[PDB]
Structure formats: C-alpha cells, structure tokens
Amino acid sequence: SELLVNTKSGKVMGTRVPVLSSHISAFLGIPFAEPPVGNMRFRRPEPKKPWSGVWNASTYPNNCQQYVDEQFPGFSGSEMWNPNREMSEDCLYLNIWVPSPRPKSTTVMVWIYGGGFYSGSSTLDVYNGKYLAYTEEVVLVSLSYRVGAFGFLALHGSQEAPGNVGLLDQRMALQWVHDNIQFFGGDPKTVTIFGESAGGASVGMHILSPGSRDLFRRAILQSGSPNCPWASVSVAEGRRRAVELGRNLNCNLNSDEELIHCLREKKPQELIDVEWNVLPFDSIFRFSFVPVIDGEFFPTSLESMLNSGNFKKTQILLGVNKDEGSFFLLYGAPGFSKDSESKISREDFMSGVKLSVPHANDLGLDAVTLQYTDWMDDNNGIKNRDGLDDIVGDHNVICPLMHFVNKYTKFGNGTYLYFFNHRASNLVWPEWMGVIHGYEIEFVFGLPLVKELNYTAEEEALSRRIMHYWATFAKTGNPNEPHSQESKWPLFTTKEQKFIDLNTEPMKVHQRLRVQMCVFWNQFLPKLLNAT
Amino acid sequence: SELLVNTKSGKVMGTRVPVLSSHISAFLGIPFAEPPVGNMRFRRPEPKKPWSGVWNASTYPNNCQQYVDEQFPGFSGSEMWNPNREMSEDCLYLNIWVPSPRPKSTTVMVWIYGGGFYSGSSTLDVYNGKYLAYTEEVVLVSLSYRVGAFGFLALHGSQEAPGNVGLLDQRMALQWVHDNIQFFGGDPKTVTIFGESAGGASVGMHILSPGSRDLFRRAILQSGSPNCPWASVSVAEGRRRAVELGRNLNCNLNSDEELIHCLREKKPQELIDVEWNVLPFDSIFRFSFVPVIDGEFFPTSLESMLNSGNFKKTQILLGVNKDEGSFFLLYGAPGFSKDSESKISREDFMSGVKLSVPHANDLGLDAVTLQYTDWMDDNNGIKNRDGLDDIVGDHNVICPLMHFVNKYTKFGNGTYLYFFNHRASNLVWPEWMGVIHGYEIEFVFGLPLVKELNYTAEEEALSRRIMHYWATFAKTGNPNEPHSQESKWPLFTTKEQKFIDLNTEPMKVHQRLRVQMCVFWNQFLPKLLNAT
Ligand SMILES: *[C@@H]1O[C@H](CO)[C@@H](O[C@@H]2O[C@H](CO)[C@@H](O)[C@H](O)[C@H]2NC(C)=O)[C@H](O)[C@H]1NC(C)=O
Ligand SMILES: *[C@@H]1O[C@H](CO)[C@@H](O[C@@H]2O[C@H](CO)[C@@H](O)[C@H](O)[C@H]2NC(C)=O)[C@H](O)[C@H]1NC(C)=O
Ligand SMILES: *[C@@H]1O[C@H](CO)[C@@H](O)[C@H](O)[C@H]1NC(C)=O
Ligand SMILES: *[C@@H]1O[C@H](CO)[C@@H](O)[C@H](O)[C@H]1NC(C)=O
Ligand SMILES: *[C@@H]1O[C@H](CO)[C@@H](O)[C@H](O)[C@H]1NC(C)=O
Ligand SMILES: *[C@@H]1O[C@H](CO)[C@@H](O)[C@H](O)[C@H]1NC(C)=O
C-alpha cells in the first residue's frame, strides 16, 4: 500500500494527510541514528540499527533538548519557534512528505532548521512540508540535529566530545536520504539541501566539508552562510567555553575525561540553564555552542577553503531578508521593546554598537559609528533605530553572505541571489522590526495558500512563485522555467553581480547588494582591527 | 591738498584715480619697513626710518621675490596671479585707496594676499582696491609681506633667521596702519583684516598671536584658516627644510651661522630655483617655507590655543568656495589637465589620494578611499575626478576651516559663515575645476562692476551684495544692514551652525557645512593615524 515503505533500516508506515482539498502521504518521526543518550551524549552520531516489524511513522517525533524562549508568553510571534513536542535527547529523526500517488523518481528537498545552533525543531507549523511537497511535486524531508552543548560542545583532542556532532547528525540524515529516499519515490541524484540562518550556514558548511559534499546535488541558503561571525569558533575558544560550562556546574576540571563525565551526569536542563554564561563578551548575535574549525569537518580555515576553491562546485540559490538585525536588537539591546516604536537615543545607539561588534576596539567602534551615522541628523531616534538594525544585519548576515557569494561564484556552476523585502500583512511583531529574519520561511513552505491564515491574494501569489522558484531550482539548477513568459531571474556573475527583489511587485533586477557597507565590513574594518 | 598726507613717517603724495565715472585718491607704494636686504635677509623686519621731503606714492611698488607660475604662458587664468611688477627683496610696501573727498573717520579694510606663503603680490589687477573703497566708502589698504624662504626660512634658536618673518612683515604694516591711517581719514579703531587662502590663514594667525591681536578690530577669512595642514610646520621640520635648502645650494652646514651666511650670499633666484626640493613627501597642497610653531608668535600649539580660548575675541566672517581642490590637482596630480575634462581612472584616483594625504599610512589611505568612493559606480571617471577634488578641498581647506569656526565660536563675539558656489560666467579655466579657490576675490573687489570685463548683470549684483556684506561687517560687526528688507545672513552659533550660500539665486540658509566629511577629517582620521 502507498503508506507502507520498505527501507534498508526496515519498514515504515506513514499516514495520509489532507492538504488544500487533496491528500499526500507523510512519514514522520523516522529514526536515522541511535539515540545519542547516556555515554553517547556529546559523541558523534552512530547509524540507526535496523528494526524488525513496521515503524509507525504517523506522528511527529520529540524535539531536541534546547533553550525555550519565554520572553513573551502566549505571543504567537515568539512561540511559533519553540518546541511544540516534548523535548528529549532522543531526537534524531526525520520526516518525509511524499506526493500521492507515490512518485518513481522525483526531486528531493531536505530542510535544515535554524535557531542559532542552540535551538530549533523540525516539527514547527511553519516547516510543515505538505504544502510544498503537494504543490511542486517534490519529496520534502526535514531532518533534526542536536543543538546547544549537546550538538556543539567542543573539547578538541577528545573523541568523547570532539565538536561538530550536530553537523554530523545532519550529515547522517543526508546519508540516510541518499541511501533510502528512492524507496519513497525520491531521486537520490537530485537532492537539494536548504535551510535558514544557522540552517543556511549549515548548508554552506556541507558545501565546504569534504565529508558531506557527495551526499547532495544542489543547495539553497536563506539568510545564513558558513563564514558568518557567529556560526563558528576556533578549537581554543570552544575548549574555553566547554571548561567554563563545567565550572558553572561545579565539575572536576582536571582533565577532559573528568569534565566530560561530570557533564554527562547532568540532567539536560542543567546545561541549558547555564549555557548563556560562557560567552566571552557582552554581545548580541553570539551563541555559546556552535561549529568548531576542527581540521576534520573543516580541513582548514573557512576563508582559505573559500579562496582556494576547496568546496563542492554546483549551483546555489541564496539570499537575505531586508531587516536581519531587528530580532536580536529587540531581545538583547537597551532601548528596543516589542510594544513601542523603539526610537533610540544617541546613547542607546552607542551601546548598541558596542553589543553588536563585541570584538572591536575603540577605533573600530568609531569606524562603525561613523559609517552608520547621519551627522546632519544624529539625534533622529528612527535613524538611530534603523541604523543599528542595519549594523546588526550587515555585520552578521548580509555582508558575510555577500562575501560567500563572491568567493563561491568564482569556482561554482551557477549562482542565483535574492533580497526578500516583503513584510507579511498579518505579521504580529511590531512595524519597526520590518522584514524580520525567518519570515520568508512561511512563503517558502506555502502557508499563504491556506485561506484561514489571513494572508492576502498577492501573498498567495508570492508564495507560489517562491515555492516554484525553489522547486524548479532544486529540480534543474535554475529557478526559471525554461522558455516561459515570466520575467527571468538572472544568474549572479562575478562581473555584474545581479540579484532580484522578492516581493509582490513586478520583478526588479539590481546589482551589487549592499556593496558600500560590505566593503566596510569585509575589507576595511577587518584590516583596521588587524592593524590596531 | 587732498593728495598730500602727512604721516608720522613723513609726507606722502598720492594720485587721483578714475573709478566708475568718478575719482578717488590712491597712495601706492608707501614703505612700512626698512628694505630687508643684505644681512637683513631672513631677519625680522625693522620699522621704516622717517623720511624728509614728499614720498611719491603715485605708482605700485616692486613685488617680493617669488616663484613665477609659467605652466601656461600667456594664459590669463594663471598669469593674473603672477607678479606684475619687478620683483625685488625691497618689497615691503603698502597701498591705500581713499574716498574723495577725504573722510574724517571711516572703516578701514586691510587686504592680505594669498599664494601658499611662496607667492603673491599686492599689486594684482584682481586686488585693485578702488572699486571697493569707492563703492562702500571705506579706506582700503593692501599690504605686502616676504614669501618663500625670504619670509619663512626657519632656524629656530637663531636670531638671524628665526622663522615667521613674513608674518612680522604683515604685523608691521598693521602697526603702521594703526599709527597712521587716521591721517588718511581712516578709523584706527575700526580696522578689519581680510585675506584669501594663505591670506586667510594669516588673518587667523594674527587672531591667535598675542603680539598682533591689538592691532585690529575684526577679521574676514576667505578659504583659509590658521590650522590648515599646509599652513604651518614644527620648528624641527622648518629646521630640516632650511638645512636641505642649504644642501641644494652646496652651503656649509656646520652651524646656523655658516648656513645663514651662505644663503645670504645667494642671488634671490638661486633660492627660488631649489625651493620645491625640500618637501618631505611627494605631495600636493604642501609648501616648503611656511609659518613655524615657534613658542613666540604662537605661544603654544594652534589646537591648544583654540581649545583654551587663547585668541582675540571679536567678530569674524568666513567661508569657502565649492571646489577648493581643483587647482592643485590640475597642477600636481596625474590625469588632470587644463584642456580635457580630466576623467580620472581608478588608478589615477588612488595615486591622487596618495599625493593628497602624504602623511597617511596605508590604513589611512584605505579610509579616505572608502569615504569618497561610490562602490556601486567605482569606475565613473567623473565621480573619481570630483571625488578627488572633494578630498583635496575637504582635507586642506573646508574641514580645517570648519574646525576653526566651531572652536572660535565658543569664545568669540559673532561668527558669519558662507559657502561661495557661483562659477563666474567668463571663467577661463575649464568647467571641471568648478568654483575654484580665489575666484570669489574678483567679486569681493568689485570687478563685475566694470562693463568691459564681461560679467553678467546678475554677477554685478552679486559683487555689490558681497562688497556691502564685507564693508558692513567691517563697519559694524554684522554683514546685514540693520532693519532693511533683504534676507538676513544669520549668525553661526555653536548649537545650530548656520551658513548661507553666496551666489546669484535667492539666499538659502543651511546648517552644518560638510559635516559628514569633516567628522571624518577632524575626528576619525586623526584618531586612526595616531593609533596605527
Ligand atoms: C556549468 O557547467 C557546464 C559544464 O560542466 C557548463 O557548460 C559547458 O560550457 C563550456 C564552456 O562554454 C562548454 O565548452 C561546454 O559545451 C559546456 N558543457 C556542457 C556539458 O554543457 C556551464 O557553462 C556551467 N555554467 C556556469 C554558469 O558556469
Ligand atoms: C557680543 O558682546 C556683547 C557684550 O560684550 C554681548 O551683549 C551683552 O549680552 C549680555 C548677555 O545678554 C548682556 O548682559 C549685555 O547687556 C550685553 N552687553 C552689551 C554691551 O550689549 C553680545 O551678546 C555678544 N554677541 C554674541 C553673538 O556673543
Ligand atoms: C500509530 O500511532 C498512532 C498515534 O499514536 C495511532 O493512532 C495509530 O493507530 C498507530 N498505528 C498503529 C496501527 O499502530
Ligand atoms: C484571522 O483574523 C481573526 C479576526 O481578526 C482572528 O481572531 C484570527 O485569530 C486570525 N486567524 C489566525 C490564524 O491568525
Ligand atoms: C611721481 O612719479 C610718477 C611716475 O614715475 C611721475 O609721473 C610723477 O610726475 C612723479 N611725481 C612727481 C611730482 O615727482
Ligand atoms: C570680452 O569678450 C571679447 C569677445 O568675445 C574678447 O575678445 C575680449 O577679450 C573680452 N574682454 C576681456 C577683458 O576679457
């Protein structure tokens, strides 16, 4: 029957799921690794042992143990991102949505969730793959991976907690998809990996890591790139944070083994409770347990890999939202609140700047302030608020992405760049936050097609265009339908560096996305900080 | 008779001079110092010994020994600035234009010529004081002062060539005006000193120097300020240049006395011939022999004098032309020529930058380039040409003036700021050079009132308004006619920092002149260069 699928790990039984007046099949909660529990906490994942009998894949699995945002209880804006299932260290599962009738060999898209490497869930309502599977006739997978210390605690030199094990969870799910998706009707030769913020950085990281490159064909990076300043630390810095985590929990610190043993005795919540105490700076947009530049997953520095062409050469489609900073300013910067316009004084600006570039010396802070201050109007509360939004976005998201694009495009096989600047008409966050990171996701997954969710007609049409761009790209390496009548999203080339806006208005093509600021962030400021 | 004037130095006979259908008296070539010749070359000036008989003051005097621009022979644009009389070391004279009939006690304006401290003449057609004396009923004086090595060679510690003797020539003429102008009908209590580029810096310097402050009432600075980077050097740097000048002339360098004696044996042209060989850097807008920060004329650093209020507190009227850089780029920077549009390549830009900020290290050069490059359009030849014009102007003229204004205004008694941006319709220099430094002078002296000089009616009216602003300010401390109907030039205050445009269109008031760039040049760049 259409809902029974025999895989190399064993049989799986799915469930029939309604979607827009029709139905498809879903196989939810399929295990791809052994539970990383007990003495396997902090370890590389191990493949799931095959099972006898039929694995019930009718309901979502547990979400990984993680920090839960309780900043605005009952507010759907923040809560749409929290775990909606029980949390467990037994959380290495994937979900698959399959068109009905079962295809024979169709394009596969594997979603990798964001969450700063400290959070995220495959099971969120905004990541429900049925609309996209159904509408574009793809097989849609969502994986999971360990986050926080569970995923990224790094004691380089140890085999017990080497770092990067969350990235190895993701790799392992990609291995399973490679090995088994054919039985669901998917084409293992045509797997696009896609993700947002840490999900986008993650996609970049599998492009770079020799151990991951062969497990997929093509890649989509939403607001995230592997070289983002928040997305990796050195093995020395990872070590330092693991030790500080131990100190917060009164562990024996005399050796890696005693530390690791002490942390493995702790309930998951005891780690989460102190996780944010190990950051080296007073900062925003910095996360405690993230990928480490280990000499294995990543054989050299990300920048030397980029410069040298040491990465998978394929097609990529990528982009950023207009207001990537606003979330982190809201949560972490004085003067910004959810229910005011958040006009920012000059003194809250300066403070904002310091939180946003924690690694800068005073001269660096002056360079940033100068770059973003209109000195004819330097007490404009809105200019200050928006200027800081831009600083956080440009430094953390846009400019690293732009550097990745320009480096990748030299050796790669086709680049498509977007700038998503539509603010959804039903957004529950205040207006000042603008086009917030993550609010393109609902368009990518087709939520605007569901009448009850309160989008406009023009939002439905934007969602359909974006889904079709994404699936057509996954299918062919080009988001445009060949020889159709609609405006063409042009290739981004080294010479002309075109991109398009994504929104409800007629396509417009531009060039050199935020180039003036990205020269500052990618060339001038780093040179200043190295010299001084 | 109206043309005979008895002064404390002796009698003087002037000449009757036609001006716009009427006549006034001129007394030209009055000596105010002993000839600084022979063993008095490089010395402080000495007062002129009084004379028996009647001094013929019917013709212009000699111009001081100086570099003569021969870059464009026969071209009136460049030649209007060269000496139009014989050159001589016997050149310390002044000229006075007196209304007819002789006033009893009228406002006096004393003009101090520019020329980078290496050139200039009181006798140029563009400095003919008769139009202004006549039209505004002031007594107009033009002085002279030693330029080049003759004026500014500095061997601090020696009494034979101590530095600043050109500034002492100017002081001495101001002393003579204080002591004698009453006999010409002038009011020694109401002397405004005014000047352009090095003339404007000079005015600033008498405002600052305790030894000069008492000799005048009020001051006008056209495109020049005492803190300009080109307008002074340290005693160490002056010493270094004097020694290098000696080396170029095969002098004995064993002591100050032997050097000074060797230089005093040289014909004036032998000094001029090697004067430009002593500059420390490959540069533009840098002159070899300029004022020195000696601990006497200037008791401390110009910046400490500014910060502390150690200066004369009076009213000042000052301003800049729109395109202050274009002359020096034309003369000294690759890619700029007089008979082309001078579209500048990226590589000539970078070179331009290096010539313009010679004292900068590489990081400083990158900061300047970034500030002035539009990275969406970085190969635009016109943007590059104009961007460099702005760099040279802002760094050398506008931004130093703006710093002076803001410092002065804290302690002073009334500041009026202008931005002259009218390009004269008969300008012989190419269009790309725009509103070139020095081309407001002809408006200040009333040349547009002379039909044969080919100005428009609206240029005649701009000249009359400017002359009347200048004379009304000299007379009262405020350029506006009290209780008249015309738009009011407002005071520049610390809080609101207003200025006006000077041109043929209705007055417009603005605020914070080039503030974005002057924060870069006055605060950020110096901080960068000190740290790195
Ligand atoms: C992506 O890859 C293919 C080749 O691997 C490129 O197409 C080749 O283009 C070269 C250069 O014109 C031709 O000699 C070959 O005929 C092409 N080969 C094939 C198999 O078509 C294609 O240009 C690349 N696209 C981009 C944007 O780099
Ligand atoms: C310039 O100087 C005069 C005073 O020396 C200023 O006028 C004085 O203003 C103070 C403050 O209001 C008053 O107490 C006096 O009545 C004024 N004195 C005289 C003699 O008028 C004048 O304000 C100053 N102008 C500027 C722009 O600073
Ligand atoms: C699988 O689990 C779901 C929910 O727990 C249950 O309703 C369903 O009947 C199960 N399927 C079978 C046949 O065990
Ligand atoms: C749609 O709007 C209504 C009425 O304004 C509201 O009560 C409802 O919650 C909205 N639905 C959703 C799913 O947000
Ligand atoms: C003064 O000099 C001028 C020109 O050299 C001459 O014409 C004039 O007659 C002289 N005046 C007298 C009376 O000496
Ligand atoms: C005025 O213009 C004429 C004719 O174009 C020219 O020959 C003359 O030189 C000009 N006069 C001046 C003083 O420039």
Swiss-Prot record, chains A, B:
Phenotypic consequence of S197V: Loss of activity
InterPro entries listed in its UniProt record: AB_hydrolase_fold (IPR029058), AChE-related_enzymes (IPR050654), Acylcholinesterase_fish/snake (IPR000908), CarbesteraseB (IPR002018), Carboxylesterase_B_AS (IPR019826), Carboxylesterase_B_CS (IPR019819), Cholinesterase (IPR000997)
GO biological process assignments: acetylcholine catabolic process in synaptic cleft; choline metabolic process
Glycosylation: residue positions: N56, N413, N454, N530
Alphabetized CDD domains for the sequence: Esterase_lipase
PTM text: An interchain disulfide bond is present in what becomes position 593 of the T isoform.
GO terms of molecular function: acetylcholinesterase activity
Keyword terms, alphabetized: Cell membrane, Disulfide bond, Glycoprotein, GPI-anchor, Hydrolase, Lipoprotein, Membrane, Neurotransmitter degradation, Serine esterase, Signal, Synapse
Function: Terminates signal transduction at the neuromuscular junction by rapid hydrolysis of the acetylcholine released into the synaptic cleft. May be involved in cell-cell interactions.
Binding partners and assembly: Isoform H form is a homodimer; the asymmetric form is a disulfide-bonded oligomer composed of a collagenic subunit (Q) and a variable number of T catalytic subunits.
Protein name: Acetylcholinesterase
Organism this protein belongs to: Tetronarce californica
Chain's gene name: ache
